[PDB]
Amino acid sequence: MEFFGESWKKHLSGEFGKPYFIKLMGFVAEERKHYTVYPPPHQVFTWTQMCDIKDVKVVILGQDPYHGPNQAHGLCFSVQRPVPPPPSLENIYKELSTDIEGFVHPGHGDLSGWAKQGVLLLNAVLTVRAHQANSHKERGWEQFTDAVVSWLNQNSNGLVFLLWGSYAQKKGSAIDRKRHHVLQTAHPSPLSVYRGFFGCRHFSKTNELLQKSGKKPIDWREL
């Protein structure tokens, strides 16, 4: 398993030999043989490269990777320079501008600076055929990313899960809320952002909740 962080591999590699995962890898490989699939192979598991699994403090669950050229890079919501922030990310930055007073839009969409601090930016589906939205859904990724969420749920303490939209909320429905904190609202995309996302103050609330378990806050400006 190339490009997969060692601390994550230690705890999740039990998935790799299961029939569903073998089937998944075979499918993705057959897709790559004939098509361009995003993100590129070295970025499928960026979320395992940015920080140690035990240093994860905050978990933001997404759905599918971006399917446009150069957009997906292995972190939900994020795009690498010089790709313009997509609409949902511009709205995330708008909420940061009022919640974390003094936050200035960084002029790019790369959320790596959060990932390094222990914000896990996990899509549920980790690849997509180029230009074809949701094309790799229901092929095995969901079970794998369920394993990731379940490991964190059972092994970590005092995480904050941010569940934006119904898909993410369903994926987080069995989180232990005595052990961790769950904040839920509408998705930040323009069609739903006015239905709860603006004003949610999840960024400030996250840091207040992290303090309850002695964790230093996320520096949301460090992008």
Handedness of CA 189, 190, 196, 199 (dihedral sign): positive
Q: Mark out the alpha helices in 116-217 (DSSP H runs).
A: 141-155, 166-171, 202-211
Measuring CA to CA, how many Å separate 64 from each of 28, 31, 137?
15, 16, 8
Domains, the chain, ordered by start: 1-223 (3.40.470.10)
At 163 the three-state DSSP class reads strand
Strands (E) in the chain, as ranges, are: 37-38, 58-62, 119-123, 128-129, 160-164, 181-185
Angle between helices 87-99 and 202-211 (to 10 degrees): 60
CA–CA separation, 210 and 159 (whole Å): 7
Six token digits for residue 1 = 């398993």
Q: Does residue 135 have a known ligand-binding role?
A: no
Q: How many CA atoms lie within 13 Å of 41's alpha carbon, on the beta-carbon side? A: 9
For residues 91 and 60, is the Cβ–Cβ distance under 8 A? Answer: no
For residues 57 and 118, is the Cβ–Cβ distance under 8 A? Answer: yes
Neighbouring-strand partners of residue 164: 185
Q: Which strands, in side-by-side order, build the sheet including 181-185?
A: 119-123, 58-62, 160-164, 181-185
The DSSP output letter for 195 is G
Computed on alpha carbons and rounded to an integer, the radius of gyration of the chain in Å comes to 17
The DSSP output letter for 68 is S
Match 């499918």 to its residue by tokens.
27
At 141 the three-state DSSP class reads helix
Q: Going by C-beta distance under 8 Å and a sequence separation of 6 or more, which residues neighbour residue 170? A: none
Neighbouring-strand partners of residue 123: 62
* Count of Cβ atoms closer than 10 Å to residue 134 Cβ: 13
The DSSP output letter for 3 is T
Q: Does residue 197 have a known ligand-binding role?
A: no
* Count of Cβ atoms closer than 10 Å to residue 142 Cβ: 17
Nearest to 34 by CA among 136, 134, 130: 130
- The experimental technique used to determine this model is X-ray
Resolution (A): 1.5
Q: Is 64 one of the annotated active-site residues of the chain?
A: yes
For residues 63 and 168, is the Cβ–Cβ distance under 8 A? Answer: yes
Measure the N-to-C terminal CA separation of the chain; round to a whole number of Å. Answer: 29
For residues 62 and 76, is the Cβ–Cβ distance under 8 A? Answer: yes
Q: Going by C-beta distance under 8 Å and a sequence separation of 6 or more, which residues neighbour residue 199? A: 95, 98
Q: Does residue 189 have a known ligand-binding role?
A: yes
Let me know the angle formed at the C-alpha of 121 by 11 and 119, rounded to the nearest 5 degrees: 80
Instruction: Please identify which of the residues 55, 64, 99, 110 carries the catalytic annotation.
Output: 64
CA–CA separation, 71 and 81 (whole Å): 9
